[PDB]
Amino acid sequence: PDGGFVQVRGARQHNLKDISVKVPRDALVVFTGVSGSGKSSLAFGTLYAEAQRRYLESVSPYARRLFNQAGVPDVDAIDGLPPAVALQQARGTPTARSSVGSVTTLSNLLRMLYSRAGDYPPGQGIVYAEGFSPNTPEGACPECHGLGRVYTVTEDSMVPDPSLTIRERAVAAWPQAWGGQNQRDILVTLGIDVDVPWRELPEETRHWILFTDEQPVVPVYPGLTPAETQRALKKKMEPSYMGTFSSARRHVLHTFANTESASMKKRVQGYMISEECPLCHGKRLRQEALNVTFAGLDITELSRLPLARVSELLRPYAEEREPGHAERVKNRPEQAIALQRMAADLVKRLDVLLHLGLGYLGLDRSTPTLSPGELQRLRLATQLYSNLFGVVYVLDEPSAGLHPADTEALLSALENLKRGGNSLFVVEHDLDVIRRADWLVDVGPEAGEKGGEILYSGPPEGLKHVPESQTGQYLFADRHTEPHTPREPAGWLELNGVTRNNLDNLDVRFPLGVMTSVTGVSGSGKSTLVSQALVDALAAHFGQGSARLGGDLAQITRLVRVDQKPIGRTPRSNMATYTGLFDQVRKLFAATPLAKKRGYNAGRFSFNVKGGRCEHCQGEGWVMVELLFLPSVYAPCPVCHGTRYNAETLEVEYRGKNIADVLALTVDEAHDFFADESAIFRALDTLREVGLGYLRLGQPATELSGGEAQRIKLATELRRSGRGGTVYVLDEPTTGLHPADVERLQRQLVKLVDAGNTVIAVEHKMQVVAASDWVLDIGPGAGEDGGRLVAQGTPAEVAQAAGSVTAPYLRAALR
């Protein structure tokens, strides 16, 4: 072997400059540099992606070489690369629905614990591990079928307005557009009156239409009048098609049970009535599996509890000290010999999770309600007992949402993963992790076209000799922005009686016209206080658990919340259209000599309206390849190749650029081009100020990270902030930002507080907390151990506070 190195040659994915790099296998390798520099294009876009393509084409020959539909990484050669697992899902994909207990494997193991070692009634038999699950017919309650809720449909729920005629869509529960008129045309063949108000039809007919199970198949004649339909039938003319009846109930319940669309399920649900299952009053299973207990609890009630509580309930059984042990060993059949080996097996797994500070989560907790750093940490933990050997793990900021007090627990789980025979590729901004890495790859001087090169590949200590590196400057040369003097409050906002999750009746104060950081351990309650409780207390006070508002209210006009979520879920969405600037752009195209010749208006230049867009992709530029059965991805449209418009629309040029020429423009280049178009140039200016000059006007939203989307939403709200009055609530606003980037972000947050506005930011890094004007330290620990206001004041005041876990770290930050 030529070292234990992976060797990469000719990598030019996105902005990579046809680079060569080598990286050790069996080591913690960290990929670093500013955002937009090309760190992900390398670790994920190139390394992970080539490693996975190769494996799957070997396990599924030709039956997976569909790959070039989706795309290949742009790279000459990679040698020495094992198979790869990404511990994060792809950029623009929906997270699937799970529980914490499913992703950790734990829920299965405790079905076998209830099946073999649990406390049955006086004499009930034995219930199998398959029958402690709501998803199996051996486990699911027969009333609700494991749903926990019972669903009905009525005439009132399905026909909200009975003055309507059947042709007037009186039965609203039927599908929109064509599917609704089909059923209506089926009824005219059957000789029912479609042009008479609903309530005037016999009860017998109204019942049938709404409730029958019957599905007759009848000739249908579109566009005929009732009378001329009956003459068609009588004279035996060719039916256009044969239609199949479906009652209103049939359609509603089949649509509910079976569709994959999320908005359709929500429409259908508007014509339904919802009630709790009475055979399992909340729980979801047979009442015989529910009789089998443990520590006084059936599976359901144990599952509500935090992982930490389940752990300390389980271990007396593992260490052989239950309420007595000599009580049932002289009588035991197998039970005690199986209960011992399982309670220890479960608690060994649980220690891994608990040591990663994840013991505040409940095993019934839904995966989409979890932060990106929470689920990547629960996936890390699961790997640590998975027994996988000889793979590469590809991680994307596993310290996101982590308190500095907890990084040694993260660092220690990564070394254990390494020591199991694996290699770790980690894109990280945390200087504490970068410092502990075996090897590091520093990418690009800057972002985009001015980045994409390798500044350094070697152990961290040698970065001290490369001066073009901004990682090396923070790490070794002491880059500060010099201290920040706290600004004085203008008023005080009171949030009293905050009941929610781990907060009992907690009373807290937020100062106004000032910037506050809300800090604390993971699972403390910051997100529960700020994002959940605060936000939907003052959304209720305006025109868009418990809580109560108070304080100097007459100072607050608007609430603006800035989330981490994408700007859109599909490639329709982009900066151009989210900022609102595309509207004037289309105006400028509609005013050109050639557009004027043809009868084009600005509408021709929309990709959201039929006419001038490519209709093959409906103007999205990109097409879904449901060829990938593991989360589907996007390929460029085979007809427009990503331009989004037909050929005739692209013949029109405003100042030597077609409309796709402008959407392909970087924020920086469009800043040049639109200098003298006032409203466009100003939108682009806030996007530039906030660090996104490398992005393209039309770049689809599915290609964007959480921090790129957060900053777009912020910029949209940056110039609207004339004077004060708006409270901005922000979750970790420096997500995916380099220490050098946050300096540029913080200046813009200063600007909007100068305007008279109040920013409240849930915050995890002391760099940002050190330049606040006020600080709220939440809860001692996580979960039951947290939830208290534990310190409040200026950063300098709080850096000396007692019974604070962030204090020492804030203090190290302050200078």
Q: Any contact of residue 724 with ligand ADP (CB under 6 A)?
A: no
Binders of ligand ADP among residues 365 to 394 (CB under 6 A) are 365, 369
From residue 258 to residue 287, what is the string marking binding to Zn ion with x (rule CB under 5 A)? -------------------x-xx-------
- Of residues 326 through 365, those in contact with ligand ADP by CB under 6 A are 360-361, 365
Calculate the alpha carbon distances from 196 to 66, 202, 211, 224 in Å. Answer: 55, 11, 20, 17
- Nearest approach in angstroms of CB 178 to ligand ADP is 36
Question: SS3 helix, strand, coil % of the chain, rounded to 5?
Answer: 40, 15, 45
Number of residues that bind ligand ADP (CB under 6 A): 30
Is 69 annotated in a binding site? The answer is no
Closest CA to 167 of 191, 197, 189: 197
DSSP state of 199: G
* Residue, CB closest to ligand ADP: 527
Residues 6+ apart with CB under 8 A from 131: 115, 138, 139, 285, 286, 289
Residue pair 308/325 in contact by the 8 Å Cβ criterion: no
73 lines the binding site for ligand ADP (CB under 6 A): no
448 is in an annotated binding site: no
Taking contact as CB under 5 A, which single stretch among the options 157-165, 609-617, 656-664, 761-769 is the one that binds Zn ion? Answer: 609-617
Contacts (CB under 8 A) with its own copies, residues 128-187: 137
Reduced to 3 states, what is the DSSP secondary structure of residue 282? Answer: coil
Is 277 a known ligand-binding residue?
A: yes
Determine, following the binding rule CB under 6 A, whether residue 516 of this chain makes contact with ligand ADP. Answer: no
By CB under 8 A, is residue 102 in contact with its own copies? yes
State how far the Cα of 85 lies from the Cα of 704, in Å rounded to an integer: 21
Tell whether 610 is in a known binding site.
no
Written as six digits, the tokens of 532 are 């959940």
Residue 773 neighbours by CB under 8 Å, 6+ apart: 484, 486, 487, 511, 514, 515, 516, 753, 794
CB 284 → Zn ion: shortest distance, Å? 6
> How far is Cα 510 from Cα 537, in angstroms, rounded to an integer?
14
Q: Is 525 annotated as a binding residue?
A: yes
Q: Which is nearer to its own copies, 217 or 539 (CB)?
A: 217
State the minimum distance, in angstroms, from the CB of residue 379 to its own copies: 7
- Select the binding partner of residue 143 from its own copies, ligand ADP, Zn ion, none (C-beta < 5 to 8 A, by kind): Zn ion
Residue partners of 379: CB distance under 8 A and separation at least 6 = 87, 88, 103
d(CA 517, CA 507): 17
Rounded Cα distance, 29 and 13, in Å: 20
Q: Quick one: 358 or 692, whose CB is closer to its own copies?
A: 358
- Is residue 273 a contact residue for its own copies (CB under 8 A)? no
Residue 527 in marked binding region: yes
Residues 473-512 that bind its own copies (CB under 8 A): none
Choice between 144 and 220, CB closer to Zn ion: 144
637 known member of a binding site: yes
Shortest CA distance to 405 belongs to which of 766, 31, 773?
766
**Residue 203 CB partners (closer than 8 Å, separation 6+):** none
- β-partners of residue 220 are 241
Q: H helices within 421-508, ranges in order?
A: 431-434, 470-472
> Do β-strands 392-396 and 726-731 pair in parallel, antiparallel, or remain unpaired?
unpaired
Site string for ligand ADP, 523-562 (x = CB under 6 A): xxxxxx----------------------------------
At 307 the three-state DSSP class reads: helix
Q: Judged by CB under 6 A, does residue 703 bind ligand ADP? A: yes
Residue type, 367: T
Q: How far is the CB of 133 from its own copies (least distance, A)?
A: 11
Q: Report d(CA 1, CA 80) in Å as an integer.
A: 9
Closest distance of CB 638 from Zn ion, Å:
7
- Interaction mask 680-699, ligand ADP, x per CB under 6 A: --------------xx----
572 is in an annotated binding site: no
Instruction: Return the SS3 of 85.
Output: strand
Question: CA-CA distance, 623 to 515, in Å (whole number)?
Answer: 43
Q: Does 238 bind its own copies (CB under 8 A)?
A: yes
Q: Single out the segment in contact with ligand ADP by CB under 6 A; choices: 345-353, 482-490, 522-530, 677-685.
A: 522-530
Q: How far apart are CA 550 and CA 495, in angstroms?
A: 6
User: Segment 382-411, which members bind its own copies (CB under 8 A)?
Assistant: 382-383, 386-391
- Beta pairing, strands 84-86 & 548-551: unpaired
Which range touches Zn ion (CB under 5 A), out of 135-143, 388-396, 498-506, 625-633?
A: 135-143
Between the alpha carbon of residue 308 and those of residues 349, 364, 610, the distances in Å are 12, 14, 56
Q: Which of residues 445-474 bind ligand ADP (CB under 6 A)?
A: 448
Give the HSE-up count for residue 246: Cα atoms under 13 Å, Cβ half-sphere: 15
With binding defined as CB under 8 A, does residue 62 bind its own copies?
A: yes
Q: Which residue ranges are tagged as binding site for Zn(2+)?
A: 141, 144, 277, 280, 614, 617, 637, 640
Q: Which residue ranges are tagged as binding site?
A: 14, 36-41, 91, 141, 144, 277, 280, 360, 365, 502, 523-528, 614, 617, 637, 640, 699, 703
Which positions lie near its own copies, rule CB under 8 A?
A: 1, 54-55, 57-65, 77-83, 85-86, 96-98, 102-103, 105, 137, 217, 236-239, 241-242, 367, 379, 382-383, 386-391, 421, 630-631, 638
Which positions lie near ligand ADP, rule CB under 6 A?
A: 14-15, 33, 35-41, 91, 360-361, 365, 369, 448, 501-502, 520, 522-528, 694-695, 703, 783
